[PDB]
């Protein structure tokens, strides 16, 4: 876990680092004056590297505190607050995604060749799903509730979307039957689906080092 925490947090901080520049920063003389506890991205990045976070909750609390200071120092209605709010949301979203499936999260960030084809445990349910404007594309189910399913599509972008349950078909349905445009992109996604299914059958699990 401690090794995993390190690499996962590094992925998140790296992503949080850029949308954090735009930049005139919380180093006014009044920063001392309005802000209780000090923190910035470099401090967080150091704490990640030195293994200072005991849990993801402690990391999240530092991200929250950074948001709180920005709000206090610039005002809740300020544009700096808007940006910092989006930063915090994005950070917490990554933590959500990590919790959803650690293996998906690692592969999605590290992106080795054919990253989306490696199996997870438990295996993700596979479906055909259509979005408004599109025909059916193959996808992995990440989670679901009664009236909708959270999927990540095969192919370009590997688009993440909520799909109404009525727009889902079992992966065992015959492709030729239902509606979709057989574009090059769609065929590429179907190839990726098949390669994923082959890796599953092979027991070809992702191996680091
Ligand atoms: Zn997964």
Residue 25, domain CATH: 1.20.920.10
85 with 16, same domain?
yes
104 with 13, same domain?
yes
Is the Cα torsion angle 134, 138, 141, 142 positive or negative in sign? Answer: negative
Backbone angles phi, psi at 90, to 5 degrees: -60, -40
Domain finish residue from 94, 111, 128: 111
Domain finish residue from 75, 96, 111: 111
Task: Write the DSSP symbol of residue 142.
Answer: E
User: Can you give the residue range of the structural domain that contains 167?
Assistant: 118-209
Residue 163: strand, helix, or coil: strand
45 with 92, same domain?
yes
139 with 202, same domain?
yes
Q: Is 92 labelled a binding residue?
A: no
206 with 149, same domain?
yes
Residues with CB under 5 A from ligand 1 (ion): 101, 103-104, 120
5 with 102, same domain?
yes
Report the alpha-carbon distance of residue 139 to residue 116 in Å, rounded: 11
Residue 43's alpha-carbon distances to 28, 38, 53, in angstroms, are 17, 9, 12
Domain finish residue from 111, 134, 165: 111
Tell me the CA–centroid distance for residue 48 and ligand 1, in Å: 24
Find the helix or strand (DSSP H, E) in which 101 lies: none
104 with 132, same domain?
no
Cβ–Cβ under 8 Å, residues 180 and 130: yes
Tell me the CA–centroid distance for residue 144 and ligand 1, in Å: 14
Instruction: Match 């370009």 to its residue by tokens.
Output: 156
Q: Is 190 labelled a binding residue?
A: no
25 with 104, same domain?
yes
In angstroms, the first-to-last Cα distance of the chain is 17
- The resolution in Å comes to 1.9
Q: Mention every residue, 6+ apart, whose C-beta is less than 8 A from residue 73.
A: 26, 28, 30, 31, 34, 35, 80
Number of domains composing the chain:
2
99 with 10, same domain?
yes
Instruction: Match 């919790």 to its residue by tokens.
Output: 99
Tell me the CA–centroid distance for residue 66 and ligand 1, in Å: 30
Tell me the CA–centroid distance for residue 131 and ligand 1, in Å: 22
- 177 burial (CB, 10 Å; 0-12 / 13-18 / 19+) is exposed
Peptide bond into 148 cis (omega under 30): no
Residue 137: strand, helix, or coil: strand
Report the alpha-carbon distance of residue 53 to residue 60 in Å, rounded: 10
Cβ–Cβ under 8 Å, residues 46 and 70: no
97 with 39, same domain?
yes
Residue of 92, 79, 86, 61 whose CA lies nearest to 23: 79
99 with 131, same domain?
no
Report the alpha-carbon distance of residue 43 to residue 137 in Å, rounded: 43
92 with 140, same domain?
no
Backbone angles phi, psi at 70, to 5 degrees: -65, -45
What are the tokens at 38?
Answer: 């000090």
Query: What is the experimental method?
Result: X-ray
């Amino acid at each position: 876990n401690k090794q995993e925490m390190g690499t996962y947090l590094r992925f998140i901080v790296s992503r949080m680092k850029e949308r954090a520049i735009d930049g005139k920063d919380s180093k006014h003389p009044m920063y001392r004056r309005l802000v209780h506890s000090a923190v910035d991205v470099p401090t967080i990045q150091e704490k990640v590297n030195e293994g200072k976070y005991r849990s993801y909750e402690e990391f999240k609390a530092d991200a929250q505190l950074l948001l709180h200071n920005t709000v206090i120092f610039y005002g809740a209605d300020s544009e700096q607050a808007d940006i910092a709010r989006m930063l915090y949301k994005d950070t917490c979203h990554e933590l959500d995604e990590l919790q959803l499936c650690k293996n998906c999260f690692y592969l999605s960030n590290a992106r080795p060749d054919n990253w989306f084809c490696y199996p997870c445990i438990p295996n993700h349910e596979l479906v055909w799903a259509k979005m408004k404007g599109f025909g059916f594309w193959p996808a992995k189910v990440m989670q679901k509730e009664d009236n909708q399913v959270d999927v990540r599509f095969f192919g370009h972008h590997h688009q993440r979307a909520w799909i109404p349950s009525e727009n889902i078909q079992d992966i065992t349905v015959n492709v030729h039957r239902l509606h979709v445009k057989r574009s090059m992109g769609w065929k590429k996604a179907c190839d990726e689906l098949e390669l994923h299914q082959r890796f599953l059958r092979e027991g070809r699990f992702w191996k680091s080092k």
